[PDB]
Amino acid sequence: MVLSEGEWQLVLHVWAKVEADVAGHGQDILIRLFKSHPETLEKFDRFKHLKTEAEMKASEDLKKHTVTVLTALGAILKKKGHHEAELKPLAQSHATKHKIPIKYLEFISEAIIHVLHSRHPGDFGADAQGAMNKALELFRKDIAAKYKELGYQG
Ligand code: HEM
Numbered sequence: 001m002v003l004s005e006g007e008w009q010l011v012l013h014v015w016a017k018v019e020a021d022v023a024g025h026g027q028d029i030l031i032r033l034f035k036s037h038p039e040t041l042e043k044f045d046r047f048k049h050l051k052t053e054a055e056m057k058a059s060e061d062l063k064k065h066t067v068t069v070l071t072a073l074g075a076i077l078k079k080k081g082h083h084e085a086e087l088k089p090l091a092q093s094h095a096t097k098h099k100i101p102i103k104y105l106e107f108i109s110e111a112i113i114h115v116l117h118s119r120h121p122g123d124f125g126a127d128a129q130g131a132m133n134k135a136l137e138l139f140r141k142d143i144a145a146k147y148k149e150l151g152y153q154g
Pocket of ligand 1: 040041043044045046068069070072073089090093094098100104105108
C-alpha cells in the first residue's frame with residue numbers, strides 16, 4: 001500500500017504537535033499500551049516491576065525510553081514510506097532481541113491513535129486518523145516482511 005502526499009501531510013501535521021513535547025506524549029502512549037494490554041509490559045525487563053500508572057509516570061527512565069521510541073517512529077514517518085534503512089535495525093532488534101510479535105505492534109499502534117485522538121482533536125479528525133492508521137499499517141506490514149526475512153514468525 002502507498003500513502004498519498006496528502007495523507008502524509010495529515011500524518012506530519014499531527015506529528016508536529018507531538019513534537020511540542022515528545023516526552024509527555026511518549027509517557028501517555030506507553031502507559032496506555034501497558035494499561036490496555038498488560039502482557040506487553042512483561043516484554044520489558046527494564047520496566048516490568050512498575051505496578052501502577054503513578055509509578056510509570058514517575059519513572060524518569062521510562063520517560064527517556066518513550067522519547068527514544070517516538071523519535072525513532074517520527075524519523076520513519078518523515079521518510080514518507082522510504083524507510084528501509086530505519087526499519088532494518090529496528091526489525092532486527094525487535095525480532096531477535098526483544099521478540100515483539102506483530103500483535104503487540106498492533107497494540108502500540110492503537111495506543112498511539114488513542115492518545116493522538118485525545119490530545120489533538122484539532123489535527124486528528126477522521127481523515128487524519130485514517131492517514132495515521134494507514135502509515136502505521138504500512139510500518140507494520142514492512143516490519144512483518146522484515147521479520148520473516150530475519151527468521152521470526154512475529
Ligand atoms: C512504534 C513501535 C516501536 C518503535 C518505534 C520502537 C522503538 C524502539 C527503539 C528505538 C528502541 C531502542 C533501540 C532498539 O533496541 O531497537 C526500542 C527498544 C525496545 N523495544 Fe521497542 N519500539 C516499538 C514497539 C515496541 C513494542 C510494542 C514493544 C513491547 C511490547 C517493544 C519493546 C522493546 C523493548 C523490550 C526494548 C528494549 C528496552 C530496554 O531494555 O532498553 N517495542 N524500541
